[PDB]
Ligand binder design. Structure first.
Ligand SMILES: *Cc1c(COP(=O)(O)O)cnc(C)c1O
Ligand SMILES: *Cc1c(COP(=O)(O)O)cnc(C)c1O
Lengths: 361, 361
């Protein structure tokens, strides 16, 4: 107890041990006589954690070469504008894969900057079925192909990504980054707000292939050019010091879990338990996406009626559950089971779901 | 001991009691079963601290009306571009008061957006003498007048601000905000990176007069429009949750210190002690600014030679002092004595300075 069953979608759950280690040295970090947040960002102590965070990330990815890890403020949302601002040139078109609410918000910002094109869309099936890699139509003058790896709101997640050739593949991985191993070489730029699966909100991780950002558009404000972060190791202005420190702590933890392949099989156990609960409910619980498009990060499901779903939420909160209330725009229920969400919280959810069913039947 | 004499210029010193209170509830906040950083930004618990922070700030300012407190990411640097992007229209000119390095960086971004004009400059005296309010020449087509209240690097600070009439006065208060009371009604927009005098880095506080940002330029990306923050209470996308929580803790503390008028007389004691040390040194220590332009936040001084200054830094570090190394571009030494820097750290600095002088004479 005193540790709620947290299924929040973002901000979300952080490992208990990383919170404790952070609490232990919160006031006095490594007997330096000060907190990590009272130290200069150009000092030897912070720069060490700053650079180690970047090194641990790539190592977890299998040590790809030719990529830079940048730490930028503004959330994944600011990246919605920064991406077309840096890569969308005149004569070209920003190609987007439409799979849900976040893909839709990414495209909206792009139009403010230049010409856009919908490469594939799953809107015809209400975003219940992800577009197949074959259905993705790329243009000859495409600046890049942007996709949302995991649709946090609708509960859909790509199992594989397409080969875009010379055209840079860009992916919003806010809700599933570092939850499963993938080939970074397929991407030109990968981004993620840290608050979903890496811990603290206030920092956005951007892994960019060096040759794409060597030279940024001169007309852009200094803070919106990628080369400002590259040439300055994300230290041009004061960085989100504490957040980066916490990101490094979560990375150490992922390694303790057996790296990406370890957290993957663990997250795969948590997901199959909850989906099993849904599939063996004889219709009481209904999945919001086609089985093949199912996400292991965000599980969306519904009940027979709107009132029944209202009863579910209330009952779950009275029993310690937090965040099951499905997103306003979609409705229903959503169990967000990121890396740090324990298998026990899922076990508890499956029992609650079984009891609730029987008390309503 | 185990608490170094921290004179860092930013990130900087935070009150020991605020660090301890924050450490106490770091893992379990108010017996909710989770940390403040694992909770939803739309939930009742975070929204309460989020809004209370805004209420405490205005209250400390004497409760001015018609102003909104916004929490934006990107640091004071992003505001360098966001300001002309939102207020510099065609036909108008962005007027700047040039007083040092930060005023100079603010102006540089502005030119990328539109027409600019130097309203007054202290460059002729090497930024040692602030321009007098009378010397400030405003244009008829001025969009606003921007000034840097405290020049963190050179050590100059305005004692009073000008009456700009219909023209909005905008001020960068990163290094002196909430260190002394002022009439907010004189300004249209005031901004400050929090890491200098309000605590944690990762959040920028913007206090804007409501009538100036009711409607932002439609062409701008969503995250760079002020009305996105106003209409959404800075909750359009995930905010710097933990940082805002820490900002609220520092505000409670400032109140315990007797509000703005209390921290002012305290900061005034710390400054006169150090300046006294400089003025009664018979030339060994030399102030970098004219007495009337002296800052109570950042004290810049020099020694007879470059080698002597190198010896000062080394000796001070071996004795527990952090951050006295003057900024690279200016050289010399800088004692940053923000709100949270104890009178004792200043007492210790004055003794060190006296001993060092005698060991070199
Ligand atoms: C959380 C999320 C975002 C928005 O992140 P913010 O930091 O709130 O801007 C964007 N895209 C996806 C896929 C997300 O999950
Ligand atoms: C610290 C400071 C800045 C820059 O703040 P960042 O958060 O590093 O962008 C700008 N102006 C002044 C006056 C400052 O003191």
């Amino acid at each position: 107890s005193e540790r709620a069953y947290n299924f929040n979608a973002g901000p979300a759950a952080l490992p208990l041990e990383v919170l404790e280690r952070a609490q232990a040295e919160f006031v006095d970090y490594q007997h330096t006589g000060m907190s990590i947040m009272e130290m200069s960002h150009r000092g030897a102590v912070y720069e060490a954690v700053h650079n180690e965070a970047q090194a641990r990330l790539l190592a977890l990815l299998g040590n790809p070469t030719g990529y830079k890890v940048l730490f930028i403020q503004g959330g994944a949302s600011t990246q919605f504008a920064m991406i077309p601002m840096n890569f969308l040139k005149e004569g070209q078109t920003a190609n987007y894969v439409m799979t849900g609410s976040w893909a839709s918000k990414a495209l909206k910002e792009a139009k403010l900057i230049g010409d856009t094109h919908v490469a594939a869309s799953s809107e015809a099936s209400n975003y219940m079925t992800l577009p197949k890699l074959q259905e993705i139509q790329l243009q000859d003058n495409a600046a890049y192909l942007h996709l949302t790896s995991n649709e946090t709101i609708e509960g859909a997640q790509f199992k594989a990504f397409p080969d875009t050739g010379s055209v840079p593949l860009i992916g919003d991985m806010s809700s599933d980054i570092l939850s499963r191993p993938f080939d970074l070489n397929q991407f030109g730029l990968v981004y993620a707000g840290a608050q979903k699966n890496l811990g603290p909100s206030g920092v956005t991780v951007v892994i960019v292939r060096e040759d794409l950002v060597a030279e940024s558009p001169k007309h852009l404000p200094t803070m919106l050019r990628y080369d400002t972060y590259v040439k300055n190791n994300s230290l041009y202005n004061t960085p989100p010091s504490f957040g980066i420190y916490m990101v490094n702590e979560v990375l150490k933890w992922i390694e303790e879990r057996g790296g990406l392949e370890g957290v993957q099989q663990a997250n795969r156990k948590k997901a199959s338990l909850i989906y099993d609960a849904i599939d063996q409910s004889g219709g009481f619980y209904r999945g919001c996406v086609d089985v093949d498009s199912r996400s292991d990060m965000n599980i969306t499901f519904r009940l027979a009626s709107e009132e029944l779903e209202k009863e579910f939420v209330k009952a779950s909160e009275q029993e310690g559950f937090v965040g099951l209330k499905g997103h306003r725009s979609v409705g229903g229920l959503r169990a967000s089971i990121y890396n740090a969400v324990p298998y026990e919280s899922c076990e508890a959810l499956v029992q609650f779901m079984e009891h609730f069913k029987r008390s309503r039947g």
